[PDB]
């Protein structure tokens, strides 16, 4: 194979986010050398002396353009001096599986080709996420270095002629012009190392009894045509014995069947209606790359993401891994509800409240301070890998149903009557006019930081809300030293209720308002009544204090979660 050097002209917009670089498919296939430039920049962060012995893992969610970009990664990694590439069969590898293999075989890191729940196909998105040797996403120091290189790059090395068959398992060796060591590409089964790790975390025998036995839990798992479909089939159906019909949408499609792979009540509607029937005991959906999940009980019973980490926390010792390893700590992002706190308080186990994004969870896990973490945005994880894991959360729930022998509906009722209930809801006000929003935030801040703000009585209907604390949440990471200021406007009431305003805006189009409402309840009787009814006083107070309808006009929210 020959090594060619291509003279390239650098790009200004290739700044990698926390989830790597994402741009619509079109930018990648039209902008000459966009992909090649970025890939050579990722490889360039690996210094020469380390390339021969380095192994990089490559894989993706299977959306359109994935195969063309993997063939580009191979040719540039090969010309650049990287000794070996472990590619998942057909290029398919979920984000939890790539994290698992990097750690397993001690790789330098890996390149994950996914834009998570963002749509796929000719007119959709495409992303290139870079993960490091601990198995987790590359930290700011590394993402900005890639960004410094991309803006000033003049040339990239490539083996144009080299091509590998992604469908054939085993080792492929290639010789590169004048170079003494051959380039090795290893095609690995997409599910095997991942299922082997899960085989030692959970008790696949209790689960084989649960899914196959006389009692047989009837489940419906929707993989929304994304990467976890091969995994559902081989692990839940072939190994655990769930009938073939338990796996819906489990064949990776390039456009995700047109529709977005986003695990929620709106996008996973087809599964929510199939669940409403009553035939199934448990239902579940996952996103494009498998690190997020949605849990459903009989008759469509929505198990809120914030309640879900709390239930797994309140029964964590039902899982063999936690029994043999112990629980180092619990954690959640600040917008997420207080249910995990009520479980954490019942034990001498530490609870961390972190801002939004994996980096916070990853750092504490690497510091051996975190075992189970959750987010209100359909995210659940543990320290078994350094990424969230959607299928791990489903087998953790099936292990709890196996142990308990109760329904999902009953596990949450018994949970709310022990720990009390955190009625949680999230209001999304997608893209608004920035000035009004910043006023709504600034005036609110001023009003929150007052002498008479604290301790005061706010009230409407059922409850009396007294302002115990009020701020703009900031975090000082204990591991990397970072400080993340003004992460969110908090309103904390003395009973346990809370209102959180988060402004996720854009210096490109406008600004998104996110309103999260967490209201605590302890009464045995009010605990089971509907969340929109019970949360109404605080939603009206949130609009009356923020004056959102006043400075932005909008009455109703775009999305309700
Ligand atoms: Ni994802």
From Swiss-Prot:
Annotated residues for binding of alpha-D-glucose 1,6-bisphosphate: 22, 116, 291-292, 356, 375, 377, 388
Positions of post-translational N6-succinyllysine modification: 418
Cofactor: Mg(2+)
Active site feature: 116
The EC number(s) this enzyme carries: 5.4.2.2
Record PTM Phosphothreonine, positions in chain: 114, 184, 466, 506
Modified residues (Phosphoserine): 116, 133, 212, 368, 377, 484, 504, 508, 540
Residue positions, PTM N6-acetyllysine: 15, 348
UniProt activity-regulation remark: Glucose-1,6-bisphosphate enhances phosphorylation of the active site Ser-116, and thereby increases enzyme activity.
Keyword Isomerase appears in the UniProt entry: yes
Post-translational modification: Isoform 2 is the major calmodulin-dependent phosphoprotein in junctional skeletal sarcoplasmic reticulum vesicles. Phosphorylation at Thr-466 by PAK1 significantly enhances enzymatic activity.
Cofactor mode of binding and number, as noted: Binds 1 Mg(2+) ion per subunit.
CDD domains named among the record's database cross-references: PGM1
Binding site for Mg(2+): 116, 287, 289, 291
Keywords, ordered alphabetically: Acetylation, Carbohydrate metabolism, Cytoplasm, Glucose metabolism, Isomerase, Magnesium, Metal-binding, Phosphoprotein, Sarcoplasmic reticulum
Similarity annotation: Belongs to the phosphohexose mutase family.
Identification of the protein by name: Phosphoglucomutase-1
Lineage: Eukaryota, Metazoa, Chordata, Craniata, Vertebrata
Gene: PGM1
